[PDB]
Amino acid sequence: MNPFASLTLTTLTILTIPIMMSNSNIYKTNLYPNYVKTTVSYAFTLSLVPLLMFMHTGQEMIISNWHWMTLQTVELSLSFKMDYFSVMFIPVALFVTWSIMEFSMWYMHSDPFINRFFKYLLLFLITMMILVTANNLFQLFIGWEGVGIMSFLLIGWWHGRTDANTAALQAILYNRIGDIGFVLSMAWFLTHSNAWDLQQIFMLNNECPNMPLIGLLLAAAGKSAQFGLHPWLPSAMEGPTPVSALLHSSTMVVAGVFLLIRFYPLMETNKLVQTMTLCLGAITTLFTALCAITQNDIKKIVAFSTSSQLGLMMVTIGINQPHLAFLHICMHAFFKAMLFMCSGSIIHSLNDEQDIRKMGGLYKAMPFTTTALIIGSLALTGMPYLTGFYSKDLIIEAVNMSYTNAWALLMTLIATSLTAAYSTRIIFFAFLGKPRFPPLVLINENNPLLINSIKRLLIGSIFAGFIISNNIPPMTVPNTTMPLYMKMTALIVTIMGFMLALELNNTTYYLKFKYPSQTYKFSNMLGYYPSIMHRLPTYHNLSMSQKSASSLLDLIWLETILPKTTSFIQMKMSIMVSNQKGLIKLYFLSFLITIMISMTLFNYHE
Amino acid sequence: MLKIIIPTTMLLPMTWMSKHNMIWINATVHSLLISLISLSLLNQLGENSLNFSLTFFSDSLSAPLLVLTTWLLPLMLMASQSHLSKETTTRKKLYITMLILLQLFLIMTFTATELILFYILFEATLVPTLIIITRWGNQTERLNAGLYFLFYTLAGSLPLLVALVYIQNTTGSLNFLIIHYWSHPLSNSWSNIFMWLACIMAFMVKMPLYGLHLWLPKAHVEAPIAGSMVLAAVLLKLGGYGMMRITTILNPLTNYMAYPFLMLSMWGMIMTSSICLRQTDLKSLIAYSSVSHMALVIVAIMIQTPWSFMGATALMIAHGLTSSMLFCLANTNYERVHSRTMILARGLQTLLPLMATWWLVASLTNLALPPSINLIGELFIITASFSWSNITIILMGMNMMITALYSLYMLITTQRGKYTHHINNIKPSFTRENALMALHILPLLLLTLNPKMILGPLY
Amino acid sequence: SFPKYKPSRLATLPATLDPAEYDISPETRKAQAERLAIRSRLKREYLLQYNDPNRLGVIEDPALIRWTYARSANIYPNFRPTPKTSLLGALFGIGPLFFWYYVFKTDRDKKEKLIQEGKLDQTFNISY
Amino acid sequence: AFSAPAAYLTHQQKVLRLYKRALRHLESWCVHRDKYRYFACLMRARFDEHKNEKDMVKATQLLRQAEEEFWYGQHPQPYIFPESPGGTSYERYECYKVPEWCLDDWHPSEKAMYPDYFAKREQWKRLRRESWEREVKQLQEETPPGGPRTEALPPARKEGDLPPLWWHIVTRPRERPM
Amino acid sequence: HVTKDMFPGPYPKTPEERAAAAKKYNMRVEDYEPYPDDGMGYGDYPKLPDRSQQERDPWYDWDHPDLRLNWGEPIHWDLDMYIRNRVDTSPTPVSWNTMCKHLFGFVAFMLFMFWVGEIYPSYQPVGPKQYPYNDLYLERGGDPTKEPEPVVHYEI
Numbered sequence A: 001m002n003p004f005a006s007l008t009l010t011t012l013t014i015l016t017i018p019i020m021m022s023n024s025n026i027y028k029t030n031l032y033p034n035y036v037k038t039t040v041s042y043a044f045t046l047s048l049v050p051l052l053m054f055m056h057t058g059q060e061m062i063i064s065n066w067h068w069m070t071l072q073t074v075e076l077s078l079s080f081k082m083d084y085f086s087v088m089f090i091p092v093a094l095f096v097t098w099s100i101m102e103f104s105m106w107y108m109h110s111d112p113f114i115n116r117f118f119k120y121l122l123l124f125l126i127t128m129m130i131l132v133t134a135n136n137l138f139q140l141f142i143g144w145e146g147v148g149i150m151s152f153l154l155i156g157w158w159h160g161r162t163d164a165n166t167a168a169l170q171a172i173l174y175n176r177i178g179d180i181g182f183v184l185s186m187a188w189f190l191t192h193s194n195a196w197d198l199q200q201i202f203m204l205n206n207e208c209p210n211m212p213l214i215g216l217l218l219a220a221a222g223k224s225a226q227f228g229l230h231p232w233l234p235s236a237m238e239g240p241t242p243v244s245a246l247l248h249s250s251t252m253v254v255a256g257v258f259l260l261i262r263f264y265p266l267m268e269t270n271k272l273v274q275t276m277t278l279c280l281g282a283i284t285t286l287f288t289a290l291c292a293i294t295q296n297d298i299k300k301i302v303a304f305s306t307s308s309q310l311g312l313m314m315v316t317i318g319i320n321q322p323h324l325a326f327l328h329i330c331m332h333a334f335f336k337a338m339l340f341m342c343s344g345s346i347i348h349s350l351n352d353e354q355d356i357r358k359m360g361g362l363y364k365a366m367p368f369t370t371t372a373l374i375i376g377s378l379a380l381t382g383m384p385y386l387t388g389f390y391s392k393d394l395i396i397e398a399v400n401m402s403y404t405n406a407w408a409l410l411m412t413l414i415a416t417s418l419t420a421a422y423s424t425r426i427i428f429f430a431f432l433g434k435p436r437f438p439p440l441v442l443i444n445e446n447n448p449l450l451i452n453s454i455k456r457l458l459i460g461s462i463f464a465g466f467i468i469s470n471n472i473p474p475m476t477v478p479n480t481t482m483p484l485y486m487k488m489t490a491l492i493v494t495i496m497g498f499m500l501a502l503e504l505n506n507t508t509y510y511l512k513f514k515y516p517s518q519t520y521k522f523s524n525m526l527g528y529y530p531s532i533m534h535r536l537p538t539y540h541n542l543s544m545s546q547k548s549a550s551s552l553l554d555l556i557w558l559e560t561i562l563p564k565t566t567s568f569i570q571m572k573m574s575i576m577v578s579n580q581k582g583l584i585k586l587y588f589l590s591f592l593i594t595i596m597i598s599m600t601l602f603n604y605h606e
Numbered sequence B: 001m002l003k004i005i006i007p008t009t010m011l012l013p014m015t016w017m018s019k020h021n022m023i024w025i026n027a028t029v030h031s032l033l034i035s036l037i038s039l040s041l042l043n044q045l046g047e048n049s050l051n052f053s054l055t056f057f058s059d060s061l062s063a064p065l066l067v068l069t070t071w072l073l074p075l076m077l078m079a080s081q082s083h084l085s086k087e088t089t090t091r092k093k094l095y096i097t098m099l100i101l102l103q104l105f106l107i108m109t110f111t112a113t114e115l116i117l118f119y120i121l122f123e124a125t126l127v128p129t130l131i132i133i134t135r136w137g138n139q140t141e142r143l144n145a146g147l148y149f150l151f152y153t154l155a156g157s158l159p160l161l162v163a164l165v166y167i168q169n170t171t172g173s174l175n176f177l178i179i180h181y182w183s184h185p186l187s188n189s190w191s192n193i194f195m196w197l198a199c200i201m202a203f204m205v206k207m208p209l210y211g212l213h214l215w216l217p218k219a220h221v222e223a224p225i226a227g228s229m230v231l232a233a234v235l236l237k238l239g240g241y242g243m244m245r246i247t248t249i250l251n252p253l254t255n256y257m258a259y260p261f262l263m264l265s266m267w268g269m270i271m272t273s274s275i276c277l278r279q280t281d282l283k284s285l286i287a288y289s290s291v292s293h294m295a296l297v298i299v300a301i302m303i304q305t306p307w308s309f310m311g312a313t314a315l316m317i318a319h320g321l322t323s324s325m326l327f328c329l330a331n332t333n334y335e336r337v338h339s340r341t342m343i344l345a346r347g348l349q350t351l352l353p354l355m356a357t358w359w360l361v362a363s364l365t366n367l368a369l370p371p372s373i374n375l376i377g378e379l380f381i382i383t384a385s386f387s388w389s390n391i392t393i394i395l396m397g398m399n400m401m402i403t404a405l406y407s408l409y410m411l412i413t414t415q416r417g418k419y420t421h422h423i424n425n426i427k428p429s430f431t432r433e434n435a436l437m438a439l440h441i442l443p444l445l446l447l448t449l450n451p452k453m454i455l456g457p458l459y
Numbered sequence C: 001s002f003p004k005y006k007p008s009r010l011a012t013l014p015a016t017l018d019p020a021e022y023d024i025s026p027e028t029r030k031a032q033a034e035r036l037a038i039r040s041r042l043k044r045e046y047l048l049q050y051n052d053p054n055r056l057g058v059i060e061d062p063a064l065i066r067w068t069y070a071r072s073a074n075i076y077p078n079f080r081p082t083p084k085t086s087l088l089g090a091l092f093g094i095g096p097l098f099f100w101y102y103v104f105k106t107d108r109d110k111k112e113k114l115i116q117e118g119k120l121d122q123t124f125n126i127s128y
Numbered sequence D: 001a002f003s004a005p006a007a008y009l010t011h012q013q014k015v016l017r018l019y020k021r022a023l024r025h026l027e028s029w030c031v032h033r034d035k036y037r038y039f040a041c042l043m044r045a046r047f048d049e050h051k052n053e054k055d056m057v058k059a060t061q062l063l064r065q066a067e068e069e070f071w072y073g074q075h076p077q078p079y080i081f082p083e084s085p086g087g088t089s090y091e092r093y094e095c096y097k098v099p100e101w102c103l104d105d106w107h108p109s110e111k112a113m114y115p116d117y118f119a120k121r122e123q124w125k126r127l128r129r130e131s132w133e134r135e136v137k138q139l140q141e142e143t144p145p146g147g148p149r150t151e152a153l154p155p156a157r158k159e160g161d162l163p164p165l166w167w168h169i170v171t172r173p174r175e176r177p178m
Numbered sequence E: 001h002v003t004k005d006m007f008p009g010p011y012p013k014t015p016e017e018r019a020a021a022a023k024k025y026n027m028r029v030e031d032y033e034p035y036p037d038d039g040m041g042y043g044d045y046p047k048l049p050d051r052s053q054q055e056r057d058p059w060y061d062w063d064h065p066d067l068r069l070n071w072g073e074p075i076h077w078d079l080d081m082y083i084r085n086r087v088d089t090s091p092t093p094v095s096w097n098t099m100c101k102h103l104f105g106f107v108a109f110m111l112f113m114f115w116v117g118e119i120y121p122s123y124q125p126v127g128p129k130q131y132p133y134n135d136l137y138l139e140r141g142g143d144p145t146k147e148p149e150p151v152v153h154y155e156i
């Protein structure tokens, strides 16, 4: 039999073995994190082989191995899709997870529940693999909700902290709002196509209507934190830094984009939904890049960077370039995870300080970290012939050379400049100048785990772009002819972002003080979106939940109409009937009245 | 079917002739054995039901409910013996007798072929529940609760009885097989409208339908733990099962007589989920969550489709297990601290880690995490409702959100944060409590591997 | 001199911008003293039980009992049928029901009369 | 946190707290150290300009416009120490804080490990048990009949007394319990 | 051990009932103010200021530090809404009604400009992309039995 299927299933299966051993003796030892990391490294090495098979012959497969249940005419089976997207994303995710687990072995060394932390990371990885390889909508929903629940558990890792629990519940709330659209798409595809698997859905929908695609767009907006449902990703920085590096930067947050990539045959036939996706991505990327340039927490800046890159992924979906969007996912994973680990090393060295205003000159004090973050910021800004270039350069060219919304294109270019702006902000404030941290200097990056994990993702961020670009078949018609100024536009706007940000950062050395502008206040306070939307709707909903639903209806009026009215009426009737004084005169007078009435009203009618 | 009934009847002299220190052991072992025997009813046919005799029959709808009842008896016995330790021998035997009689009535109710016998057993289940609530409840409100539990039911069921006998005067039979084979349409008349209402409103009250549900928070909050477990897990479903049997004679009237009940169910599902967000009592929150899930079940039964019937069956079983587990979880903390206020005891994950894991799994099944059977039923009902009208998703999705919002809320309030400083009597979890939680949760997860076994006749 | 900050329900007035904290009278000082005395008496009452070595269980808080009772059982005895309560109950309890009934009935009437005309595109719709 | 609050803040205390808040927010605005030192000296001079004002109405109104200026010109994202109430590590280690009474519920097998620790624990429990009644008597003696006025507690005053209500202060879990 | 007369009761009308209610809730009589005597059922319960728990002093030694409550003090009617896992009413650097104007203006401007950009799109000065076999008639769904209208392309 073909080794392809066996290897693809074994790569996923072996990741579950430490979960089975979580009740064994090794889980109570200090060797469990190393065991989990070694298992993930072996899984990555194994998954490298189906990738080679696909790069050789373009091999793709679907495996329907276990029949779950049959609902008259709808068969639900455990089926895995092993197309280009799955076999390309699995090794990238495994590589990033391997680096991040090696990093976590050093970052979380003193945590009393480090074994539980590694188990939780493995559980998230398993759920995300389920999401990526799913062939029907039910399995994909299983992966969707699994990654959501693992995100909830890892954001609220320090469960004695109120802010962590609030952030975890916020993430749940926003992703549930997206789940509404996911469930709408599922119901539509079942009642209209009589299927949940991708094959029949593609066969039966040649002109896909608006409803299922809009549901999918809502689910993607929730999962990838687009402008309507954006605020939960920055607040997810409450979790430990490895959680931010793995889930909320490079792997889980792209899931929504991945969903739109899974259904691109249906989406390319609908232009309204394509325009909606493009506009949502454009406003998202520019708004989040605008918020990033004034933030002072390093994790918050990198999280807003992640949101802006997801917005760019959505705009390249909107111009009908799904393969380019997937390529950007794979490229951005490397350097965004590396940037988060560099931030984590800085934070750990400076006694868990995350504010860039207290980070001084680390260029010489943390040389390897400085080198890695410089290379990562260069990859993020699209420096030529780096990992981000082969992805970002093409996306900008495709938006420039397409029949597209003009406002969306302008917003994308401005966001491209703002990317270099906030990268400059991070580098200038964290690594240049004079120290601004407390005088007891604890700076130490001489740990082999940290160095090796950073080194691995650094080699990735340097060469993966070239390797992956030259080792895949052409899925697109290339833009070979364009005006020269349009060819150089991305570099030009990046240069402007660099120069303008550097000038404004250098003016902070002058002995001049001025009160802030209103535009600065809008940028720093996140467009006031969490100040209004996290207070007004929540207050009104909870207020109506108590005053109207609980008290006015259940405790008052529903009591009043049925049971209290009955009790009152029966009590009054009982009092009226039973209050007879016992005098026979009154009784016998009533008897006479009764006898007369019976003689007149019944006895006269026969 | 007597192979289930007679051992259950034999449970009574066995507990009344047991030694004073052996009642719990004997009752638990033999109820578990009865559950094992009842597990053989799951072999169902497809085409038609298992017709044991003229009196009793088993269907793909009845069998999961019977297995759930027989499985719930040992869990109730396990959960009852802690707070009944100081009780005398005779009153302990009387409590066990009430539980056994309730199981016997429910088992006969779920398998009766004839609608009057079903009605008689359906009412007979009232008496043991009333005695349990009003004799072994803890607070002074229990008496009032009992009254609310009683007259809400009877005010619905007395018209049904009349309708039933009326039907037998015109049809000639109340045997369910005859009723199904000889079914005829209902014309559009006032008499037919009122006969429809008499046939439906008793099961509506039992669900309970939003607006007729005020008895449920009182009765479930004031009841002892076994009372709450049986009231939520099995008794509510008596409504659903009843509806699934009686709608076969109500077509095509249900095509328009169902609009007010559908509106009530959808809006009140939103309303009760929202009520759960502002609740100071931990048991009250669980009761209102039950109301919301049962509203979804009402929608499923009213729209009368195979997918909706399958979803309603699955959701009934899943909710029974989940709500029983949640009530037991709340009762553990209540026996710790002797208060049901949710914010009194906080940060319990620090002090009771394994019980925190149980809380987490129960909360996950409450919000219907895939691939649990809770979500299987919910998704089937939502798909059928979407086919009924595409706008329903707006309400359904909203419900989903609110459900998660209160579930985790409960989890965050009791398990996370910091512990209350002055509460210093929180002892480690007993093996009995952990085993009870496991015996709730493991069958629920195993049902995911074989969902059809709970999907009902329409599968 | 500078733009003035105005408070709202969900963004309240800061203490430092509150004039009441700058216009101080002897009665204000004595009221603050009484508030501190009440707080201190309650604190001593709590701490005498909190540090008691022989105390085991829960220190019952009458304030929590009063709060839960007022939120649950004290509501109906203090309810009075009023035009304000009558209109609010009628609206919030009945208006949504007819609103949703109208919406769903209109949608289903459209769908049904569109099925009758033979123009709905029901192909591949065999599950329901 | 360790000091019992008073009924009100004096003008001097309010002025000092405003000085501290203004300096901290200025440091948030002026990231670099030399610039912050320059502008903090300017703030100190502007603050000393009215140090010797006698009319308390004038001083109070000066404090009012100082507060108004601070509220208009405060940093929207001021620097917060990591373990401060708004910091990124505020209540991070609260889940690792376990009350000492939990040790009484350990299985005897668990207490077989750590024998010396539990011997010292029994010694501490004996001390608390023997001191409780004297602590209560001292609190009753020293409290005016109209109840306590503030939350301040007295020290021990005899030869072998302990300060009343000391157990839960002394047996705090830790700041880094695990 | 809470007796009967320590539970909340009806709305107080006489000054003596107000003094008794203030004493019951451990409040000063000058500070005690009930909810207005409408029919909503508040009864005797005090109407506390509508601040949230996040506004309380975090440097005070609260009996419940996470809730920032003290034992015995009267509890706000809406405590479970203001627990600081939830609705926050803290003062903001920028006024409410000014954040609202800026946010709404930004969103409305973005929506209007996206509509304008839809009206005036961007494109390149090229003609349509051409495909060989009647615009790939058989590839895009086929129907090879109806002789499709010939799409012919010429060199330029």
Ligand SMILES: CCCCCCCCCCCCCCCCC[C@@H](O)O[C@H](CO[C@H](O)CCCCCCCCCCCCCCC)COP(=O)(O)OCC[N+](C)(C)C
Binding pocket: B188, B189, B190, B193, B210, B211, B212, B257, B260, B261
């Ligand atoms: C708290 C929750 C409790 C549970 C609530 C249960 C809800 C039950 C409601 C029953 C729904 C419909 C009942 C009957 C169907 C139609 C009713 C009527 O309004 O429709 C019109 C009926 O016409 C008139 O409106 C007559 C009805 C008006 C008189 C009834 C009084 C209604 C006032 C509301 C009373 C509140 C009821 C609930 C009390 C608690 C239709 O006109 P027409 O097609 O020509 O006649 C159809 C009947 N035919 C065919 C036999 C001739």
Ligand SMILES: CCCCCCCC/C=C\CCCCCCCC(=O)O[C@H](COC(=O)CCCCCCC/C=C/CCCCCCCC)COP(=O)(O)OCCN
Binding pocket: B152, B153, B155, B156, B159, B162, B163, B166, B189, B190, B191, B192, B194, B195, B196, B197, B198, B199, B201, B205, B212
């Ligand atoms: C928890 C509270 C629940 C309250 C439930 C109350 C509603 C129950 C439904 C009505 C009960 C009585 C109906 C009688 C049973 C129907 C059998 C039947 O078919 O008889 C009808 C007769 O129908 C009737 O007479 C019923 C009229 C109503 C009599 C009692 C009125 C009580 C109040 C009416 C409205 C309340 C019912 C609905 C309430 C909904 C729940 C709140 C026709 O028989 P014939 O005489 O032979 O005529 C054939 C030629 N047409």
